[PDB]
Amino acid sequence: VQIVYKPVDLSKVTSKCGSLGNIHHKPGGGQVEVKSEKLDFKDRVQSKIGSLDNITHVPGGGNKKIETHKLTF
Amino acid sequence: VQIVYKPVDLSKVTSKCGSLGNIHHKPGGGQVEVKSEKLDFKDRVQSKIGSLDNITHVPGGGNKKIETHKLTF
Amino acid sequence: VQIVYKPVDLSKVTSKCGSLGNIHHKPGGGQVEVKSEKLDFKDRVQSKIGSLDNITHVPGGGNKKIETHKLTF
């Protein structure tokens, strides 16, 4: 038995952008009010209140190549 | 048995953009109000209130190539 | 037995754009109010209130090429 696993990759993933800007992300400009009375809890509580984990992601590229090679015998 | 696994790739994934911008994302500009009275929780509680996990994602390319090669004998 | 697995790819996935912009996303501009009185929860609880998980995705390309090569003997 002979196996010759010989894939050839000459690909490209490319971008050109002339200018990139004037990006505004303003999450949670509005008021938040939370009121609690006579609450009972008897197992774990997780609470997040306000502006949390908001992302502004502005790469000049952001291009991806994902390549997977597998052989099983 | 002979196997010659010889795929060849000269592909391109390409973008050209002249300008990218004037992007406005404003989650949660409105008021949020939560009032809780006499509530009873006998198991785990998770709570999120306000403006959370919002994304502005503005890549100058954002092009993707996904390429899987598999052999099983 | 001989197998010669030799696919050849010279394909292009291409985009050209003059300008990309003036994009406005304003989720949750309206008021949210949540009164809650005498509720019993004998069970796990998850709650989300306000403006969550909103996305403004604005790639200058955003082109995709997905490619799978498979051989089973």
Residue numbers in the entry:
A (entry chain C), B (entry chain A), C (entry chain E): 306 to 378
Paper text:
Residues 297–391 (using the numbering of the longest human brain tau isoform) constitute the proteolytically stable core of paired helical filaments (PHFs) from the brains of individuals with Alzheimer’s disease. Here we use time-resolved cryogenic electron microscopy to study the in vitro assembly of recombinant truncated tau (amino acid residues 297–391) into paired helical filaments of Alzheimer’s disease or into filaments of chronic traumatic encephalopathy. At later time points, the first intermediate amyloid disappears and we observe many different intermediate amyloid filaments, with structures that depend on the reaction conditions. At the end of both assembly reactions, most intermediate amyloids disappear and filaments with the same ordered cores as those from human brains remain.
The use of sodium chloride instead of magnesium chloride leads to the formation of filaments with ordered cores that are identical to those extracted from the brains of individuals with chronic traumatic encephalopathy (CTE). In the CTE reactions, a greater number of intermediate structures formed than in the PHF reactions. Most intermediates that formed in the CTE reactions comprised two identical protofilaments; some filaments made of either one protofilament or three protofilaments were also present. Most filament types also adopted a J-shaped conformation at earlier time points and, as time progressed, more C-shaped protofilaments appeared. As for the intermediates in the PHF reaction, the 332PGGG335 and 364PGGG367 motifs and possibly a tighter packing in the C-shaped protofilaments appeared to play a central role in the maturation of J-shaped to C-shaped protofilaments. The presence of sodium chloride in the CTE reaction affected the conformation of the β-helix turn in all intermediate amyloids that formed after the FIA and the final CTE structures, which showed a more open β-helix turn than in the Alzheimer fold, together with the presence of an extra density inside the β-helix turn. This extra density was previously interpreted as sodium chloride ion pairs.
